[PDB]
Design an enzyme around this catalytic site. Structure first.
Site, PDB file in Angstrom:
ATOM      1  N   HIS A  20      14.810  51.589  53.966  1.00  0.00           N
ATOM      2  CA  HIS A  20      15.850  52.610  54.247  1.00  0.00           C
ATOM      3  C   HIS A  20      15.296  54.015  53.947  1.00  0.00           C
ATOM      4  CE1 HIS A  20      19.037  49.326  54.093  1.00  0.00           C
ATOM      5  NE2 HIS A  20      18.122  48.799  53.284  1.00  0.00           N
TER       6      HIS A  20
ATOM      7  N   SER B 212      -4.069  75.840  62.463  1.00  0.00           N
ATOM      8  CA  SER B 212      -3.218  76.888  63.083  1.00  0.00           C
ATOM      9  C   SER B 212      -3.656  78.271  62.578  1.00  0.00           C
ATOM     10  CB  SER B 212      -1.756  76.625  62.789  1.00  0.00           C
ATOM     11  OG  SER B 212      -0.921  77.642  63.329  1.00  0.00           O
TER      12      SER B 212
ATOM     13  N   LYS C 262      -3.326  75.034  58.707  1.00  0.00           N
ATOM     14  CA  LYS C 262      -2.396  73.888  58.909  1.00  0.00           C
ATOM     15  C   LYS C 262      -2.958  72.962  59.995  1.00  0.00           C
ATOM     16  CE  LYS C 262       2.532  72.790  59.647  1.00  0.00           C
ATOM     17  NZ  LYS C 262       2.357  72.100  60.948  1.00  0.00           N
TER      18      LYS C 262
ATOM     19  N   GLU D 171       1.001  61.962  67.907  1.00  0.00           N
ATOM     20  CA  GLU D 171       1.909  62.631  68.873  1.00  0.00           C
ATOM     21  C   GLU D 171       1.602  62.127  70.285  1.00  0.00           C
ATOM     22  OE1 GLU D 171       1.495  66.823  67.846  1.00  0.00           O
ATOM     23  OE2 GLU D 171       2.215  66.337  65.813  1.00  0.00           O
TER      24      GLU D 171
HETATM   25  N1  LIG Z   1      18.829  46.343  51.653  1.00  0.00           N
HETATM   26  C1  LIG Z   1      17.729  46.000  50.772  1.00  0.00           C
HETATM   27  C2  LIG Z   1      18.078  45.225  49.499  1.00  0.00           C
HETATM   28  P1  LIG Z   1      19.362  43.950  49.656  1.00  0.00           P
HETATM   29  O1  LIG Z   1      18.736  42.483  49.464  1.00  0.00           O
HETATM   30  O2  LIG Z   1      20.351  44.262  48.406  1.00  0.00           O
HETATM   31  O3  LIG Z   1      20.155  44.047  50.912  1.00  0.00           O
HETATM   32  C3  LIG Z   1      16.982  47.251  50.399  1.00  0.00           C
HETATM   33  O4  LIG Z   1      17.538  48.123  49.695  1.00  0.00           O
HETATM   34  O5  LIG Z   1      15.807  47.343  50.813  1.00  0.00           O
HETATM   35  N1  LIG Z   2       1.898  73.910  66.286  1.00  0.00           N
HETATM   36  C1  LIG Z   2       2.340  74.846  65.259  1.00  0.00           C
HETATM   37  C2  LIG Z   2       1.328  75.955  64.993  1.00  0.00           C
HETATM   38  P1  LIG Z   2       0.774  76.789  66.503  1.00  0.00           P
HETATM   39  O1  LIG Z   2       1.605  77.962  66.849  1.00  0.00           O
HETATM   40  O2  LIG Z   2      -0.729  77.263  66.190  1.00  0.00           O
HETATM   41  O3  LIG Z   2       0.739  75.783  67.751  1.00  0.00           O
HETATM   42  C3  LIG Z   2       2.656  74.119  63.978  1.00  0.00           C
HETATM   43  O4  LIG Z   2       1.739  73.683  63.248  1.00  0.00           O
HETATM   44  O5  LIG Z   2       3.860  73.982  63.682  1.00  0.00           O
END
Ligand SMILES: N[C@H](CP(=O)(O)O)C(=O)O
Ligand SMILES: N[C@H](CP(=O)(O)O)C(=O)O
Ligand SMILES: N[C@H](CP(=O)(O)O)C(=O)O
Ligand SMILES: N[C@H](CP(=O)(O)O)C(=O)O
Lengths: 462, 460, 460, 462
Positions: free
Chosen positions: A187, A317, A323, A330
């Site tokens: 989750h 970047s 960055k 992607e």
């Molecule tokens: N839903 C499960 C545990 P559960 O066995 O209580 O459903 C989790 O939190 O990963």
């Molecule tokens: N792609 C952008 C940077 P850029 O403007 O160089 O494409 C990011 O890292 O969020």
């Protein structure tokens, strides 16, 4: 720079440097839907080459002049080898039987064979597009044959090799990361430990099963419609032609092509393309999950999860200095989304057969080949430019795992889940460690906790 | 155990004495055993049939229908519309593609309930005849589409838009509440430049505002009713003015701007308006997937995730992982979003497959549209009341994650990006703060002047 | 009106005295009000939970579970599996993405029913505890996937494949029956060359045969059960052998070849097998759309359509168009086909959106898979019994349509296609028979020798 | 024939006849997914031209040298006018932000501007790709801006004009066929009469509503992200830049572009592309129905419905001599199926935004432009090569209509539907006409039937 050919509608200038004829130029005038981007995919053209080669050789048993047959075979081989790609200008968005492309193939092989025999281009002498190159055939049985040849070759040459490389790279990383204990997330919440090797073994199984699913979807792709002619009866074709053409294609490709046991099913529907698209759709679900997990596990470097260090392939970047982004993740997830859309296009086409012929054929094979090529190429690129270079941030992994409140799960069989829940809730509220909260709470001693709570011991059943 | 006996041209039929449906309905239950009770015609279609037959009965008084009969039909139709007779509709979606079986089911139930009100015998068609009185001036071909559009419009106005309005208002409240909290942006999931938690939430607010605009933009052609087209759209064996009067009566009864479809051929041969409305709900599902999934990930931890948000705890924790609590409303919402996208493809395939004068995918198309509208509406209320209104910011954690981000050096771009990249790369490699004075590109006083998150939230 | 009082860490809860569910279930009904009773967890999932808990209780005797308790859990679990306690499951699909609420619902119902059998107090968790006994060695994370695969496998073997088998056998019977009837082929919907009605139907037979092969090919990984993976797939706080013993017990109870999933991480983090099975049903839907739509159009008329087939009349005719009867089973089948295609997209979106150790789209994915399997199974039986088995050929009409086809001149291609095209164009323009002797390409005796439909049905 | 540029990864041979630089060559090496068929669509490249032109002019207000700005504007105009298409080799399957293409545009405009100012290609002197061409911008706000410009232009130039031509052609035929009484078909069964003009008026309404639906889906496509920069804050851009760039693009295109009121919504999601795709999806349902109806109404010539005579554009089949097929109906219905698949691809991309940026951008715009182009081109082709030339088979139509047993519906108000049903059932069983069956049955006289049963009178309410 133009010769002059005729059809029942008028005279047509045909470029002298082109092997196509009047039917093809007419088809370019009548089907201006999308630019050159929408041209019949090369693998379909090449598969037509293989198919016409097989038909020409086999037709010698049924009265085709060996001299002509030999020239058709040489010209067909050039098509199959991708030497004549510029002589196929027609788009996918044509006749639903792929008739225009069959005629385009018949004309190009006819004129190239004529040239080899020192005849005049456009003369249909001595090689006639219909009487010789299309002998014993219809578009109705040849276009489906080309679809299945093209699909099978793309699966064996591009899709499966791509997934094999990805499988092997993920498996290497699984082994490499077998000792590193990280925190599980269910989750998206802090859960109990598993090895980074165990998590990656999940990805390995998904890719292994993807290759099994694709192979499971191939048996009916190996069925060729060739011999069904107009409606599946095989009217105006010879007994044995269907079996001999299939056997010849199997020999030429080294793939286990056989004649479709029911030619009505083979012409009236392309359920095998829907089946194969379905396997690629499942593959896309697997690859979406793998690529998205690696994206998020590599997130940061500081305010993400930061468990993985992904290879840097591009400079950072300039607008956010230095960055660097999970760009292969992607490309892979965008491909996954595309395959899912392509699958719906294939399904709509597959569902809309009418009586003796499904006339969504070009659209269906375009989407199947698009999906296979994208999955194959993305698998290689994701492998070489991301997976093989992935490193574990062992320091960060160890911190995130040791800090998890859900290590108290180990105390369930020792002190019961009610007492374990109190320790976790108290440690959380106090910003404290599990150990000291359990001692302060007085459910166990410092020595008991160190014995009962070892991540190394939480990786299997007992 | 108690059965009466009705007849059709195929034989005699046992009909439960405690049921208002007749021979056509029992025959239909025998011929269309596809899915269990879960596949029964959705209640909103049944209720819409109630409204429609009520309108037709009143209007038909202008065209020779006995007021005594008309009045009883109106009272019985009102009971259907008010959901008092839901147990008298046993037919599934997977019937005739025109929804003929359900039209007959409605005609029979209203007929027998009206008969009962007039002290007649159930099953007798005396004095209220299902075809001659309750179905007067009508076909299934124009009534089923009319019921689809009435049902769709009511579900949009009563369930879908109110749900999205509650979600919009709750997200907007949180946007204002979190307007001062500066967090770190994420692009490609990577550490980016600052924005306020209020700014991020304003994105969600706009998405929900635009969702409501998109749904309202998809409604004008849902307000077009087919009633009057009869068999093929010509209006054969119906009276001039019936189409306009029935539409106006439905508008008056519902307070929604229903009008007669200007082209009855388009109204019978296609349900392009249901495909259009499904498309609006499909876009809404993309918006809600993003909002719910972002909140799921922002709330992740509490220690080894992002941990920027504290989501309300509504359930006790796991017993298997003691005290573990999960973003369960986010899961319900994202599962609904995925369902709407599938439903949309079902609606599209149905919509594309009309033949000549009649599209015969009608029950399947309205089932998917009502399913999507109900799920989106109910999930929006549940996600609002059981998650959004109770969301808290982990200000301590947010402040740490934001201040420690290497991409605060972006502020130094216009001052000193080559030098800014060196500082970030060095601080990262050394596990140092942006200290990294050592590089000697500015003084401790210059950094404190040039790098204030408060100043990086707008253009200058 | 009669309520008992249970507690969770959030407060006291009124529980109906006539219900076997407890505090966790009532809490779940308060927090997940998304869709009505129509959105309740499908019965096959509930029954599969019965089978699974039965297997776990028996196996857990090897790992310290009191035989007296184990026996009572087994009897109560059997009642769930046999569909005796369906009214004690009020929770919707649109809950936690792990199906935790339903696992707890199953644990509580089996606990209280077992308590009742042992003469204890309902709600007391004495002597059968929902978590300590009924959920022993288990998580929702490994049990919900186990229930999905058990439910999917049983629905495929008991409903889907038997339905397709009946349709295959009925189509094959008709193929043989119609083997001598020569009709006209249609390509692009245009008049083509002859084939037998038996040959056309053999196409449909192959499609259904291949549908059953495709579904069976998609089952091997459905037989893999997650049971033993517990929280994240490690099998933490479960015993060695539990995974293999529970799988073997389920195989023995069902007579299906269930085995433990070789990789529990893959089994929890993804439901690729449900996407695979949905894909097989998606291909099946394309086959059935084509078969049902062809039969619809071949049966069209009776006068101004194609009118090659006479479909059984199951309902009385329209009162609005007196005596008009419609291919209603074709409509039910093609609407089902469209639904399966939409369901498949819902399953795909869910399947693609796993996060780390757990996919939390589980309830939505199994709902769509079971919906598709049930609809395909039931529609195949209904389409078979109420249409296919009763189809008759209009031999008089077929013979006229076939003999009058201009494309019989195709037979003259190897004898005299330029000359054949002239004959067809002239006969068409003149409204003449292929008489068109006049053109002087052959004698009346040559035409009767060269143009026999009986000879145009195979290669030579 | 190559110059030498460098990035932080090595030296790169750049063809001297190319205006792209080191970032583009690096991108071609790292993203080998699909061939040249998968290259970024031209409309996105042209839209980048318009956008960079607008930014350069506007940036003069914020310190950009007019000499440089002028050269950037001239180079950008050449991109926009499609003069430099060969200098864009990058595929869709790149960074999900479209960063590689933004850099490709920045490099090409930089080197072309350098050339105009007599500088050295590859020098970044005096026009710098980042400092000048990308000034005040990120990929994050420019790629979305290019998507919306490209989408809007394709809708106004290709999609709507195509649908307008189809609307006008169908409306002409509706008027032309207004007098011809044919038989209605419901469930494919013989029904009551309507005019061929009435049936075609249905198609006209569907296409009219398609154009309304597309226009209804445009308002939020006119919102441009330009000014949001990295995360939507507009960090390191100037106040007024967002409004001025939008106004400049509106002036350059003559379309009502405005700045997106919320830049967070504009970067984090592409809900407007999902909305526009949805309108095209509805259009595809309408066109599937219209094209499929015309296909079936034109079926025969003898063993189909044969109500319409469709124009012959190709010669007939050689395998079935003279056989001619509704090929434009096939092209249109295959396009319709493709748009439905494309829509699912767009939906999956649209649903999968993460925090401040949706990184499915190239895949989403590719599918939207593909659908718009195919629908536009198919609408023109279906109009010119089928609709305008459709003729009614009045003799056949009249036979099929007069023979329908469901003309007895006219007798419902005269003799009740029970007696009308007996006439139809008896006439059917006897192979008789309605008239004589009603006289033999003795429900009315020969003169009453001729008064009560006139198709001309069954076309409206009474
Ligand atoms: N839903 C499960 C545990 P559960 O066995 O209580 O459903 C989790 O939190 O990963
Ligand atoms: N792609 C952008 C940077 P850029 O403007 O160089 O494409 C990011 O890292 O969020
Ligand atoms: N397309 C085929 C004929 P061909 O084989 O010429 O493509 C048909 O009309 O059924
Ligand atoms: N289903 C309608 C008639 P009805 O009004 O009886 O449903 C048709 O046959 O076209």
């Amino acid at each position: 720079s133009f010769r002059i050919e005729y059809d029942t509608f008028g005279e047509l200038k045909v470029p002298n440097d082109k092997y196509y004829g009047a039917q093809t130029v007419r088809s370019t005038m009548n089907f201006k839907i999308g630019g050159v981007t929408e041209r019949m995919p090369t693998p379909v053209i090449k598969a037509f080459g293989i198919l016409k080669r097989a038909a020409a050789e086999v037709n010698q048993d049924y009265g085709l002049d060996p001299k002509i047959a030999n020239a058709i075979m040489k010209a067909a081989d050039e098509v199959a080898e991708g030497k004549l790609n510029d002589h196929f200008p027609l788009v996918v968005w044509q006749t639903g039987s792929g008739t225009q492309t069959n005629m385009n193939v018949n004309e190009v092989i006819s004129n190239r064979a004529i040239e080899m025999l020192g005849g005049e281009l456009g003369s249909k002498i001595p090689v006639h597009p219909n009487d010789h190159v299309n002998k014993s055939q219809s578009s109705n049985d040849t276009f489906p044959t080309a679809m299945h040849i093209a699909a099978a070759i793309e699966v064996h040459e591009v899709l499966l090799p791509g997934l094999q490389k990805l499988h092997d790279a993920l498996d290497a990383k699984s082994k490499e990361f077998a000792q590193i204990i990280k925190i599980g997330r269910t989750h998206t919440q802090d859960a109990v430990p598993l090895t980074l090797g165990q998590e990656f073994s999940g990805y390995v199984q998904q890719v292994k099963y993807a290759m099994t699913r694709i192979k499971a979807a191939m048996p009916r792709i190996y069925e060729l419609a060739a011999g069904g002619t107009a409606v599946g009866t095989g009217l105006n074709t010879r007994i044995g032609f269907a079996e001999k053409v299939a056997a010849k294609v199997a020999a030429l490709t080294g793939l286990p092509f056989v004649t479709a046991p029911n030619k009505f099913e083979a012409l009236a529907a392309h359920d095998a393309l829907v089946e194969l698209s379905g396997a690629m759709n499942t593959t896309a679900c697997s690859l979406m999950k793998i690529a998205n997990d690696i994206r998020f596990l590599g997130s940061g470097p500081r305010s993400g999860l930061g468990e993985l260090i992904l290879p840097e392939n591009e400079p950072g970047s300039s607008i956010m200095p230095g960055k660097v982004n999970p760009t292969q993740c992607e490309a892979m997830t965008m491909v996954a989304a595309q395959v899912m859309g392509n699958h719906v296009a294939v399904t709509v086409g597959g569902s809309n057969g009418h009586f003796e012929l499904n006339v969504f054929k070009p659209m269906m094979i375009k989407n199947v080949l698009h999906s296979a090529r994208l999955l194959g190429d993305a698998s290689v690129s994701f492998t070489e430019n991301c997976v093989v270079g992935i490193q574990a941030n062992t320091e960060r992994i160890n911190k995130l795992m040791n800090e998890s409140l859900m290590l108290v799960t180990a105390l369930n069989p020792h002190i019961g889940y009610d007492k374990a829940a109190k320790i976790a809730k108290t440690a959380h509220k106090n910003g404290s460690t599990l150990k000291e909260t359990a001692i302060e709470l007085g459910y166990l001693t410092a020595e008991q906790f160190d014995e009962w709570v070892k991540p190394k011991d939480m990786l299997g059943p007992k």
